[PDB]
Amino acid sequence: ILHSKRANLYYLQHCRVLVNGGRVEYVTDEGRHSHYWNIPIANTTSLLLGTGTSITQAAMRELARAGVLVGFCGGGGTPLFSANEVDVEVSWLTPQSEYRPTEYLQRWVGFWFDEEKRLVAARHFQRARLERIRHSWLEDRVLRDAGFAVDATALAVAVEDSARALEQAPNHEHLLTEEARLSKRLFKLAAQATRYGEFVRAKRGSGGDPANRFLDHGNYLAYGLAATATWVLGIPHGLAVLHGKTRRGGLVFDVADLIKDSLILPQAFLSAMRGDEEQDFRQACLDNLSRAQALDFMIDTLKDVAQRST
DNA sequence: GCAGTGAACTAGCTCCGAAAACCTATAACCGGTTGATTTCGAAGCGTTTTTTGAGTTTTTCCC
Hints:
By secondary structure, the protein is mainly alpha-helical. 54% of the residues lie in helices and 11% in strands. The longest helix has 25 residues.
């Protein structure tokens, strides 16, 4: 249930959170034996209330006493609906509320306005993304066994070439387009491996074939996971690195990018070819995300870029 | 003047479709002959027509 070992983030489902006798208690079908009792309550913990759960104001009081962030997310924890805002660590605020302020916003803003540094960040994002493609498509054979048998030499050549291109070109405007070309080739490779036939990527949900729908669902979950990552870091969604400065919710899409083609896309084609239900697809996606430590990776990346930007 | 959307735009690509560019045979055209018949023309001024130009009014087309 520990959703991110890097963030001390826990997912609670099928239980009520209430305060009896001055201690926050979980009313669950397992009673005393539920693992929720092992939840450490400290300023380092952060909760994610899941499906079928409710919380009492008294609990909110006790958690605030202990300084524990709370957030509501849907099935499996991908769509993050609402959460507590996290503080910002600077010398002029200084409340004693015992809430672990986080300093990453200052680091982010310290460079966000300098375009050259912003570009350097974009490059760093894409380096990470490609290396996660090469990892999941080649190094690990779980997909191979599942049925996603694809050629390697063509994929390796394409990825090598795109990586070679990343280290070049002057502005965001090229990077976006280079990624788009890589995207197209990856789609073609996946369709060939899946024997799905010809594939064309419609957008704004105009597609009707299973592949398109499953891609949309997968991307929706990925966005939710990224939103969780940013919220844990406290960075507002508007300070995008690679998407346009006017794009509402740009940053989450920047962060979501580092898994779409690594983990969502193959599963979308696999499930479409296998003829799965939408529910089966959702469960498979969440299982893949859990297996890959996705949230932890996207946390590590954001921290790495912050430290590297100095 | 603002918040908002939709249109113009980005790189390089394979991949695909089309007009462009090139090769071939050969039928029509090129050159040579005779020579009595008809056709054409040397200057140039006046007449008549074209056809170019000149403007535009109207009509038609496309959106």
